[PDB]
A paper describes a structure:
Intermediate filament (IF) proteins form flexible fibrous structures that provide vital mechanical support in higher eukaryotic cells. Nuclear lamins are IF proteins that play an essential role in maintaining the nuclear envelope structure. They have been implicated in diverse cellular processes, including mitosis, chromatin organization, DNA replication, and transcription. The lamin filaments make up the three-dimensional meshwork underlying the inner nuclear envelope.
We determined the crystal structure of an N-terminal half fragment of human [name] (residues 1–300; referred to as ‘lamin 300 fragment’ in this study) at a resolution of 3.2 Å. This spans the N-terminal head, coil 1a, L1, coil 1b, L12, and the first half of coil 2. The asymmetric unit consists of four protomers (chains A–D), which are bundled by an anti-parallel pair of parallel helical dimers (chain A:B and C:D). A typical left-handed coiled-coil conformation was found in most of the coil 1a and the N-terminal four-fifths of coil 1b, in which hydrophobic residues were regularly found at the heptad positions a and d (highlighted in yellow). Linker L1 and an adjacent coil 1b segment (residues 70–84) showed the hendecad pattern, which induces the formation of an untwisted helical section. In the helical dimers, coil 1b consists of the 18 N-terminal heptad repeats (residues 79–204) forming a left-handed coiled-coil structure (~22 nm; one and a half super-helical turn) and the two C-terminal hendecad repeats (residues 204–222) forming an untwisted helical section. The hendecad repeat region in coil 1b is continuous to the N-terminal half of L12 (residues 223–230), unlike previous predictions proposing a flexible hinge conformation. The untwisted helical section is bent asymmetrically near the junction between L12 and coil 2, leading to mismatched inter-helical hydrophobic interactions. Coil 1b and its flanking linker segments (residues 67–221) form the anti-parallel contacts between coiled-coil dimers, and the remaining parts (coil 1a and coil 2) are bifurcated from both sides of the contacting region. From these observations, we concluded that the anti-parallel interaction between the two coiled-coil dimers in the asymmetric unit of lamin corresponds to the ‘A11 interaction’ of vimentin18,33–35.
Numbering used by the authors:
A (entry chain B): 45 to 251
B (entry chain A): 46 to 247
C (entry chain D): 31 to 251
D (entry chain C): 27 to 282
Write the structure that this text describes.
């Protein structure tokens, strides 16, 4: 039963390496774990920092475009206010334009009627001048006729006075001449009566 | 048995001590994994965290970059509209000034029209008066003429009247003279016959 | 006495008869005178008849002309009255015409002013109408926007629930493979240890038996 | 009778004086009449020359009144013609004016109608203005609400997008973790099987060394024993050779 004891001794001689190798065994068991895990973690940190450096850039650009948006918003607000004011002023101006045009139209009509009245007055003046000239000529003609009629009246008067004086003087001369004839009648009477009485007696003594 | 049991106990204790002296090293390796995996597990979490944050920033960036373009378009058309509104505004102000000028000239022209109308009223009044006096004088001359003609007619009747009066007075005066002379002759012959018969009585 | 009174009475008788004779002779003389100044008037009768004839014609015409002076006087007053009535009617109608003309002037003025006010009102109404129409267009385009907004929202919700579903399934697969690998390693180590605790004796004693068989088979036989 | 006689004588003388005065006056009268009887031929002339002047002045005044009356009649003829002309002119003017008034009243009625029509259209438009202001106010409200709706919708879309992207990121993360744990299990299994195989070759090499050693010693002892057996066989054969040699010697050594 000594050969099995020798088997135990050989088992010990085999255990020698089983304890000896433990160092490099556990070292190699650790190196693979460290390698794989450190590779994974390293690549993780790589991608993480890449994403971070992207996020910084994104936030920067975002702040920039926000600033631009605020500027353009203020400018736009002022512009739209100015446009509203402009539209209000346009409304007021169009109202004033309509009112002014109304006043102008009324004035133009009220002036055109005056022009018409002026022209009518001008025609009236013309025809009054004509009618006045005609009346003047008629006045001259009738004046001439009146003057001539008075001339003929005066001539008639002169003729009448002439004939009157003629008849008067004729009557006067007739009466005067008859008186003288009476004078010679008495003279010739006394000288004539006996010159015929004796003429009758001388022949009366005969027969 | 003195070397047997010594070798048996030595081998049993040797293997049962060395195997379990490596077992604890293996468990320490397990702990090393228990830390490594933890750190990897938290880094793997922050990675998704910053990924989410970056997605958020990109979304907001696109949002602002769009609502900025919208405002660019709106403000552009508003600028155009404002240019047009100010242009037409100046046009209207000028037009209103012109209309006011036209109104002033129109009024201050119809005033002078009123003056000319007044002058022409004067002219028409004077002409009407003059024509009236002309017609009056015409009528006066007509009346005077027909008066002269009537008086001419009456004188023409008198001219033939005094003629007949003359003839009548001449007839009467000659008849009276003849009566005187005839009476004288009759007296003559009366004394003639008287003395003739007287002497006839011897 | 006796003689004187008889003488004087004879004188008185003589004087009386003298008065009588003188008055008679004077009456005779006056008779001749009044005969003369009558036989004369009958001789001047002719000029008297002529004069009276001419006067007769004179007033015969005078009455006619004086009748004309009446007729045309009446006619004159008649036409004067008619002219007065026409003057009144003319003054009234001309006053009414002047009034109508003034009313036409003021009326045209009010017309122009009124049309100005109406034109301004219509312009402002047209501006309000334009604003209203543009607002309606705005509402239309905002509806056309909300539609596509909700469509995109639902699509994105679907894609979201898809992504989260795939995430959950990925967690399932992860725990699955982790448990599998753990149990696989555990079973491998178990079979390792069982094989070793079997080879602990099962091959030791039998192999040393075969070795003794070879040694004894070779050393002697 | 004495004084009576004296008084009668005196009265007689008085009567005598009366009749004497009368005969004087009567003789004067007779002389005057006889004087007139001669101048009859001339007082007649004065008579007729007087009545002539009377009638002549009468005719003169008559002709004067005739002339004046004719003048005053012609004057009224002229006045009558004048007024009858002015009436004509006035009635012409009034005819024209009474036409113009009709036209004026016509255009007056028309223009007043037009003015009332305008004053109606103005109130119409002014009411439309208010009923439009209310409308556009309501539309402003509608747009104001719809803008808020669209804003909220866009916000929710942004959020859904964000959480979806986050889900996909975590998905890729877990995929990488999956592959990692795979490549870890591989190396772990490899490292365990390596140890187990080193122990197995430890056992098998022990078996081998023992086997070839304990067999090599036995085979070497066997071959050594064979060589010894052959050596002893050869030495015994050499003993037989020398024995046969000496026996042949003694056989040839045969003699007396």
């Amino acid at each position: 039963y000594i050969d099995r004891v020798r088997s135990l001794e050989t088992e010990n001689a085999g255990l020698r390496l089983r304890i000896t190798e433990s160092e490099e065994v556990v070292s190699r068991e650790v190196s693979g774990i460290k390698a794989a895990y450190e590779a994974e973690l390293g690549d993780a940190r790589k991608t993480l920092d890449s994403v971070a450096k992207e996020r910084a850039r994104l936030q920067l650009e975002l702040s920039k475009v926000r600033e631009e948006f605020k500027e353009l918003k203020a400018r736009n607000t002022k512009k739209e206010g100015d446009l509203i004011a402009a539209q209000a002023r346009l409304k007021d101006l169009e109202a004033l334009l309509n009112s002014k045009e109304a006043a102008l139209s009324t004035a133009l009509s009220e002036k055109r009627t005056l022009e018409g009245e002026l022209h009518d007055l001008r025609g009236q003046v013309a025809k009054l001048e004509a009618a006045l000239g005609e009346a003047k000529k008629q006045l001259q003609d009738e004046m001439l006729r009146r003057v001539d009629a008075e001339n003929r009246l005066q001539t008639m008067k002169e003729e009448l006075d002439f004939q009157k004086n003629i008849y008067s003087e004729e009557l006067r001369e007739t009466k005067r001449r008859h008186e003288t004839r009476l004078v010679e009648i008495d003279n010739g009477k006394q000288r004539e009566f006996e010159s015929r009485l004796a003429d009758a007696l001388q022949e009366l003594r005969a027969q």
